Amino acid sequence: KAFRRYIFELYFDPARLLELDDDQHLQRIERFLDALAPLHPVLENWYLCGDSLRDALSHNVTEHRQDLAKALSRDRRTRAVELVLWNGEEDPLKGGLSLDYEASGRAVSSRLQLEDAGSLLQVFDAPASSFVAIFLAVLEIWPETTWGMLAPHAYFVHQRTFPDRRSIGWIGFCPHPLRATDFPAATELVDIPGRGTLLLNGREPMDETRREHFERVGEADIKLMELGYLPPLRG
Amino acid sequence: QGRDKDCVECPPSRGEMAIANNGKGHSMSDLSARYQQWVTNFPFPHEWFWSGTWWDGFDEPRCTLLEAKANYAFLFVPLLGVPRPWARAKVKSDLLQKAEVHSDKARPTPPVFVEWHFLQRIVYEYCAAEYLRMGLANLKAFWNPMPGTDEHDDYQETRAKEQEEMKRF
Numbered sequence: 305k306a307f308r309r310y311i312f313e314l315y316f317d318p319a320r321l322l323e324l325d326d327d328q329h330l331q332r333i334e335r336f337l338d339a340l341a342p343l344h345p346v347l348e349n350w351y352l353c354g355d356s357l358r359d360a361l362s363h364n365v366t367e368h369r370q371d372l373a374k375a376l377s378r379d380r381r382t383r384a385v386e387l388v389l390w391n392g393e394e395d396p397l398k399g400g401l402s403l404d405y406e407a408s409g410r411a412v413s414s415r416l417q418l419e420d421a422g423s424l425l426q427v428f429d430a431p432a433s434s435f436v437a438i439f440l441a442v443l444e445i446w447p448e449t450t451w452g453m454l455a456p457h458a459y460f461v462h463q464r465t466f467p468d469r470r471s472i473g474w475i476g477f478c479p480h481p482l483r484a485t486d487f488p489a490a491t492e493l494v495d496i497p498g499r500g501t502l503l504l505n506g507r508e509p510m511d512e513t514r515r516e517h518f519e520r521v522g523e524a525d526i527k528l529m530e531l532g533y534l535p536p537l538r539g
Numbered sequence: 540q541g542r543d544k545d546c547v548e549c550p551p552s553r554g555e556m557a558i559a560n561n562g563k564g565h566s567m568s569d570l571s572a573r574y575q576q577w578v579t580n581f582p583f584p585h586e587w588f589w590s591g592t593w594w595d596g597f598d599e600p601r602c603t604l605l606e607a608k609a610n611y612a613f614l615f616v617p618l619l620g621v622p623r624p625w626a627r628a629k630v631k632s633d634l635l636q637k638a639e640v641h642s643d644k645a646r647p648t649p650p651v652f653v654e655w656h657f658l659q660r661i662v663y664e665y666c667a668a669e670y671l672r673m674g675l676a677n678l679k680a681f682w683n684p685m686p687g688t689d690e691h692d693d694y695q696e697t698r699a700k701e702q703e704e705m706k707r708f
């Protein structure tokens with residue numbers, strides 16, 4: 305099939321994300337996978353990763369939540385944690401997707417990412433409705449969310465509007481409230497109370513080859529930086 | 540800003556060679572070891588220890604720290620350019636966050652740089668784009684295949700047939 309690579313990372317406050325111990329850390333991931341399951345059957349079961357496919361199918365953590373603690377590795381000196389799970393589906397075309405959650409002391413490595421987000425495009429019926437659902441999830445369980453974005457791989461890596469800092473992508477979350485007319489026409493604002501708003505750039509999935517979808521996110525990030533909202537790439 | 544009376548060019552020159560012993564793989568003949576020795580010119584199983592981290596090599600005249608990665612394509616799906624979802628943890632530790640640590644410790648820049656040489660093109664294209672996403676400015680990735688591999692036969696195919704496409708155009 306002819307799918308496209310997509311990025312789905314959300315950055316959290318590195319200062320107070322470390323304050324969570326290994327107990328409350330596991331509970332938020334647990335509440336996130338519980339949120340992921342009703343979106344598609346492929347998101348129902350999650351496993352530990354492994355050096356081999358045979359190894360990575362040995363620990364179903366949805367069936368046995370007692371082994372979720374085995375995913376989280378913690379350094380005692382720096383107090384950084386990381387946790388990696390995966391779909392149990394081997395083929396990215398059929399929805400195969402891993403979950404990468406790391407809470408290091410640095411803002412560049414305090415993130416949650418779904419790799420690769422293009423697998424969810426090959427399986428979601430309405431991608432916009434399902435993609436925002438796991439957004440509003442993340443932000444309910446993690447109040448420390450500083451930034452979020454969903455965009456294709458070729459666009460951010462090579463055609464990002466401003467290379468020195470991040471982007472809003474197709475759907476991103478900025479931790480402040482926004483005015484509607486400060487943005488292009490068909491960019492939808494859903495103001496969540498307390499932590500900011502979420503910006504959607506057209507309910508159809510972005511195409512880096514369409515000049516329209518190019519300018520929407522372009523003219524966006526120009527605004528997003530005009531108000532001082534676009535955070536730097538390195539922290 | 541300022542930069543004067545420079546006492547120590549290349550701080551990583553104060554490192555040392557040592558046996559790795561990272562619970563890796565032994566034997567001098569594996570593709571992992573032979574590729575590492577060709578990129579770094581370090582005798583197996585010696586590596587470079589500086590600033591508390593391990594580096595595969597160190598080009599002192601260029602003040603560039605080297606790291607070589609051989610067999611990793613089996614954790615990616617070839618045609619799609621993405622890793623296999625079950626190998627995310629191994630890709631994260633061995634390829635991504637190890638390069639993030641290399642970038643953080645290779646300072647000041649200039650003169651301290653770091654390069655990652657990949658035997659396989661498929662592994663190079665994924666990682667190099669990941670480093671650009673993380674903004675590792677002092678880290679450069681290369682597809683540097685070794686003579687004798689089948690990856691080298693594919694490399695000289697396109698670098699000898701790019702001079703047939705970048706000439707008639």
Ligand SMILES: [Mg+2]
Nearest residue numbers: 571607608609
């Ligand atoms: Mg190796």
